Design a protein around this ligand. Structure first.
Ligand code: HEM
Ligand code: HEM
Ligand SMILES: N=C(NO)Nc1ccc(Cl)cc1
Ligand SMILES: N=C(NO)Nc1ccc(Cl)cc1
Ligand SMILES: N=C(NO)Nc1ccc(Cl)cc1
Ligand SMILES: N=C(NO)Nc1ccc(Cl)cc1
Ligand SMILES: C[As](C)(=O)[O-]
Ligand SMILES: C[As](C)(=O)[O-]
Ligand SMILES: [Zn+2]
Lengths: 416, 414
């Protein structure tokens, strides 16, 4: 039949063909010999620091592709403005070695980047992103202002709004704008004398870096870290976020009255800040983005992962379960109640959140829209299926095709 | 080339060098990954009307023979050299060859060992191999299949086993077991397109009826077997009820669960897969071990296109099925898996929960890293259908590739 991947949904028996993968211009990590789809950070997109200006030849073609996507999106492909814009980009890259995007071009690109992210299950919302243009930012202090505004607009007192703030792109042999923290909101991770960790083990390094840079550390389990912001060719500066701006949700359970005594909590805004946004060859090293949480991210991963808060055993003990044997399914029981507590608490505090059932269903709708709109949707099965109750959701039974499309969000090396 | 494999829970790192031994292509390319696809689009097992390319078959055979003698530490020995000559001789004169029983045993175990989607491979060295290559009729297949079932079941103390029927031959039909498993519950399509029983078995159920089976009307009616000898219509055989061990499902604390009348068989014996050893193909080679509780409790009983009992259990538990956020699906699913575990343990029938199973697979990964320098594994299948990140395999990166001997899918004989 069609010379494209045949995709099947085993629950409904329906079939589709992905023709969109034909548009991918960047190789992934797999080969006919072996599949490397499970690797978290395969040395592929990895935007390793490329100091010396990029080959005008490679950049120009990437730029040309992006401009074609843009004009196609506004239904003016082949027009006079399209050919003139193409000329303008080539000319600019010819004299300066690089080029700049127009406002509307940035907005379209940022949205496409989200839309193109294979691992994001919340892409049904891709068309609704508030793009803050911060390309005029010239200091670490101004970065903080832009970030504080982002948090305020995005948090919106609990009625969260997706947003992204874009700082200046990487320039020819010049220092990058960088946000050292992986997220705008992170709990400190304090290395203990016995080797253990108090707080979030995932943030041990960034916490120590904050201390090395003058931060006076606390000693709690949920201490909000300050931000280490870095302007070009300058050392990072430390900034403490005002408490009133960081909305947190104390966790309680709908029926287990003791759950609240656990003193657990999580912040409302998931704002990733260490990823690079690539559009038409241009690289925005600092471009924090945020949406809202899917409950399993908090209740299953951040709270139950063995290398994170690891509260599974504590909750099971409180539930008086037999943690001495696997077949009692104590981990499964506790995990469920913990996820329920998260959903319940966020709802109680009127903070936006979506459970894994609602989210995955909406993603199936997204796949249908995308099938019609672009002929497919790049998706990473291992990341789209939730960490708990996987086969209980519709996505588990849906085959997916994974590939890299640009604009895109990519991981990049740590600045230190 | 050689992929760096990391475990994100422990931070440990290994390098898979075993993948370099792969001689068969998967569905992925640098352009796009198709790891989530269940079946191959082309990596099928096309007809066998003509003799396979002598050159190709000879290379696959020499490699297998090589693997075998290395397994018995007699590589380069006189026996090794002479056996290779024997295989050379047969292929050149007949276009094919035959394996010795000891070779067949080694190959079967290796095929299981190499299966990327199998989480129970730590047991790979313990497999009872029945040589049924001297079978010339469906009736004889039935007798072999019955002995496999008696042996494997062992009155609840399940033992891993495989029975191997005659290999495929050029221009001749294949021996085939039409059922996908030796034990399957009927799926009857009724009135308004609904289904009484197992929806997964609707087609096989009707084929059985068309071939003379007098169908029942229950939710768990054990299907008869359709066995097919070369170029012959398949024959119908009813399995002796005393050979099919089943486990009534009840819950440890929820008294009403037993009233649901749910149940499942003890023996998971896949019979529609093809076993390939040294280029030779075994179209009928049913294999079995024991169930991992999630296969029954989660997939078989909770999949929307299967028994789909989630809502019923939820209502019995009087849960808020009005909204997703109440996590009623998650709560019901957990109790169902608990019921399956409770029941099998009560009935004294071998079963393994997903936590235990995954822990043992991690040990297997380590055993294989030292033994062969890697282990082909399919993340999507190794991770259980529920509580994924609560198991260690979720946090372990894996490299997937095809090694031979191997088990593979084949076209349905109709
Ligand atoms: C509207 C709410 C949203 C929800 C519910 C959502 C949820 C998720 C989830 C569950 C993941 C996987 C997390 C993990 O397993 O580590 C994810 C990944 C991702 N999301 Fe979304 N997302 C949303 C908004 C956004 C926004 C606003 C953007 C960007 C503009 C975005 C970009 C991404 C990217 C790039 C990844 C992949 C990260 C990686 O490579 O590990 N998401 N999202
Ligand atoms: C001893 C107990 C065993 C357990 C607990 C076990 C468990 C499993 C599970 C859970 C799967 C995944 C099925 C699914 O995703 O629905 C699987 C797949 C597989 N197992 Fe095992 N297994 C065991 C023994 C065996 C034996 C004896 C063989 C053969 C000699 C075998 C061959 C396979 C094969 C070929 C697959 C891959 C199926 C495919 O590619 O679709 N297993 N096993
Ligand atoms: N809900 C989320 N975002 O809005 N979660 C989320 C978590 C991590 C990354 Cl990298 C990207 C997204
Ligand atoms: N993860 C699995 N385990 O059985 N299976 C599986 C089921 C459906 C699709 Cl689409 C992909 C994989
Ligand atoms: N428990 C099992 N085997 O022993 N289950 C099982 C189910 C399907 C396939 Cl294909 C292979 C194995
Ligand atoms: N499926 C995931 N979603 O977050 N993550 C994940 C974690 C570890 C490995 Cl090895 C592979 C994938
Ligand atoms: C509830 As606590 C022990
Ligand atoms: C058992 As209730 C309906
Ligand atoms: Zn792949």
């Amino acid at each position: 039949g069609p010379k494209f991947p045949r995709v099947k949904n085993w629950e409904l028996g329906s079939i589709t063909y992905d023709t969109l993968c034909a548009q991918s211009q960047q190789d992934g990590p797999c080969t006919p010999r072996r599949c490397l789809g499970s690797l978290v950070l395969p040395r592929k997109l990895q935007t390793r620091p490329s100091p010396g200006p990029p080959p005008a030849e490679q950049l120009l073609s990437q730029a040309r592709d992006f401009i074609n996507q843009y004009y196609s999106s506004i239904k003016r492909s082949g027009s006079q403005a399209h050919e003139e814009r193409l000329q303008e980009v080539e000319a600019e890259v010819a004299s300066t070695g690089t080029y700049h995007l127009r406002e509307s071009e940035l907005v379209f690109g940022a949205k496409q980047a989200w839309r193109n992210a294979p691992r994001c299950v919340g892409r049904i919302q891709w068309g609704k992103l508030q793009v803050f243009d911060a390309r005029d930012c010239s200091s670490a202090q101004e970065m903080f202002t832009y970030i504080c505004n982002h948090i305020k607009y995005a948090t919106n007192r609990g009625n969260l709004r997706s947003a992204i703030t874009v700082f200046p792109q990487r320039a020819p042999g010049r220092g990058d704008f960088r946000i050292w923290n992986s997220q705008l909101v992170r709990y400190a991770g304090y290395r203990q004398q016995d080797g253990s960790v108090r707080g979030d083990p995932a943030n041990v390094e960034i916490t120590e870096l904050c201390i090395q840079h003058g931060w006076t550390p606390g000693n709690g389990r949920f201490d909000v870290l300050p931000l280490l912001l870095q302007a070009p060719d300058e050392a990072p500066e430390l900034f403490v976020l005002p408490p009133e701006l960081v909305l947190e949700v104390p966790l309680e359970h709908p029926t287990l009255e003791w759950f609240a005594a656990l003193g657990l909590r999580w912040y409302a805004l998931p704002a990733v800040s260490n990823m690079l946004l690539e559009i038409g060859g241009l690289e925005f090293s600092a471009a924090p983005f945020s949406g809202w949480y899917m409950s399993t991210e908090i209740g299953t991963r951040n709270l139950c992962d063995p290398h994170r808060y690891n509260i599974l055993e504590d909750v099971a003990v409180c539930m008086d379960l037999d943690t001495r044997t696997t077949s009692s399914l104590w981990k499964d029981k506790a995990a469920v109640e913990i996820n329920l507590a998260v959903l319940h608490s966020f709802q109680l505090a009127k903070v936006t959140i979506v459970d894994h059932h609602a989210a995955t269903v909406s993603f199936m709708k997204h796949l249908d829209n995308e099938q019609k709109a672009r002929g497919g949707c790049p998706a990473d099965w291992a990341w789209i299926v939730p960490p708990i109750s996987g086969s209980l959701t519709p996505v588990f039974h849906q085959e997916m095709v994974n590939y890299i499309l640009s604009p895109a969000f990519r991981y990049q090396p740590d600045p230190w």
